[PDB]
Amino acid sequence: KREIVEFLGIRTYFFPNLALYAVNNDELLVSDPNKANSFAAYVFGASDKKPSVDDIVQMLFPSGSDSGTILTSMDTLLALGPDFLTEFKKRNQDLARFNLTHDLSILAQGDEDAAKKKLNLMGRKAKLQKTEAAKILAILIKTINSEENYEKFTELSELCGLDLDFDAYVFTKILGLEDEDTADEVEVIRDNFLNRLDQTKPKLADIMRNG
Amino acid sequence: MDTNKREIVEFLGIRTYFFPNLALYAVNNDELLVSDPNKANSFAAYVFGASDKKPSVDDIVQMLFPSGSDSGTILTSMDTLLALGPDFLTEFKKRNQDLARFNLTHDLSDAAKKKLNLMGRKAKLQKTEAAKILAILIKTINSEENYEKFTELSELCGLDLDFDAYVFTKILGLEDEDTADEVEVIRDNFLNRLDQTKPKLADIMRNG
Ligand SMILES: [Cl-]
């Protein structure tokens, strides 16, 4: 089941290992950020150096990941876009040996366009269900089916309705969705997250707010 | 109510922002809707499936603005008039002129639609029901065709305002071959609440 989790003021669906990293390496990020993980340091505003694709994959799929971790991170791969589809397919092929699969596997099976029209209708009905799990699936589908970056940002912004502002912000940062057309909205998303992080980790929040 | 703030209200299982007088009417008059629907209110009878006669603009306005409405009731019902489109804008302007004598006004009183669009996007990101309702209203107003308008009104279900989404779908004629399966989900969400408090209303809406 798609389940939101929380780590000491960081509420997340898509990025649980990144949230855990920030819990475990708070002092490092605040006091010696050039020793910290590059993906974490970039997200939290402690470095302007961009993470590599490999940095992202290793944070999503740490050694020893179990099937639940893998399935959740495969959702994140889909949200990040076609750059990550080969990684998604490799992870899905491995799961099949255990009789497991990602529930949106039709996206990896050719005729992607036809699958996305069917998924569009599925996602619209999922959003009308009353569970967090269904609403996450709906947002994921709408994000996958977005062509342009402004549309992708608009659909990912719906994560804030589930108090997943952290995830919306991480996607914005990693996918480069902040520009002149979206900057004022990105500021609201960032501030929503920081208003919560201030309550548990104010020094880390201060880095993110300033530097 | 005697407040400027947008507030969701509830009456016996019926949660609503845009149609509080209609919700209360149905709670008070469910047996009449069952047993003598032609003598019941025509707007209520149409929404709940007791009659296929469409209400008039005047029937709808009278339900939204009953005798004795206070300022919050007027302001809320003015939101409803905006979402109901061009046949209701003259009434909106009449009501807004009344309010000005008391130093009150509706807060939304191509260029304006772009400014409104940016305002609605930032409102949706706030953490209050009042801001989310405003955002949905703006997105509805700025919609240019029925399928887009239905898509934006559907967001009301995210605030458990399925009743309002259903009423708008019925009055604006938004149920068609493209939207019918989604309309069924909205209807079923509302029926799920009704089955627990007004089984009679649920039965009419399912049967007749
Ligand atoms: Cl879609």
Residue numbers in the entry:
A (entry chain A): 5 to 215
B (entry chain C): 1 to 109, 117 to 215
Pull text from the paper.
Two PGL proteins, PGL-1 and PGL-3, are key scaffolding proteins required for proper P granule assembly. PGL proteins can self-assemble into granules, both in vitro using purified recombinant protein9,11,12 and in intestinal nematode cells or mammalian cells in culture when expressed on their own. These in vitro PGL granules display liquid droplet behavior, indicating that PGL protein alone is sufficient to recapitulate the biophysical properties of P granules in nematode cells.
The NtDD has a novel fold consisting of 11 alpha helices and a single N-terminal beta strand. While each ASU possessed two pairs of identical interfaces, one of these interface pairs consisted of a network of conserved amino acid side chains making extensive salt bridges and hydrogen bonds. The complexity and conservation of these interactions suggested biological relevance. We conclude that the dimers observed in the crystal structure represent the NtDD dimer detected in solution.
